[PDB]
Each structure stands twice: as structure tokens, then as C-alpha cells.
Amino acid sequence: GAIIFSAKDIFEQEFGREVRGYNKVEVDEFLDDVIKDYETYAALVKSLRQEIADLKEELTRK
């Protein structure tokens, strides 16, 4: 589908280390919130597409 990652992928993603790399705590606490948005967005599109399917079922029948 059109989405690259799941929330689980954001949590499981590994990175190499380098000298003068990004502060891991800061990246991780930022990715905490990214993960929460992946969960919210996944739930939102599911809720919405399911509701649409129900409305079309109602509309297209007697």
C-alpha cells in the first residue's frame, strides 16, 4: 500500500552509531511521538474507510 512504515517499524528501526551522531535520547523521544501518530493515523484511516464502506452499502441498496 501507499504507507512505507508501521508504528512497529518505527519502534524496531535500528541505526548505526557514529561519533558526533544524533543524540539517541532525543531521536528516540521524538520517535515516541512519531509512533503515536502512526498508531493514530492507522486507526483513523481504518475507522474512516470502514465507515465509508458501510455508508456505500446503505446508499447503493434498496
Binding site: K8, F11, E14, D28, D32, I35
Partner: peptide
């Protein structure tokens, strides 16, 4: 939830 990447023990799973 369980997917808190900043969990101190994340390394136990990922």
C-alpha cells in the same frame, strides 16, 4: 504504549 521507543529496556526486543 508498548511501542515507546525511549523505553529504557527497548534493547530487550529491538
Amino acid at each position: 504504549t508498548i511501542l515507546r521507543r525511549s523505553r529504557s529496556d527497548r534493547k530487550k526486543l529491538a
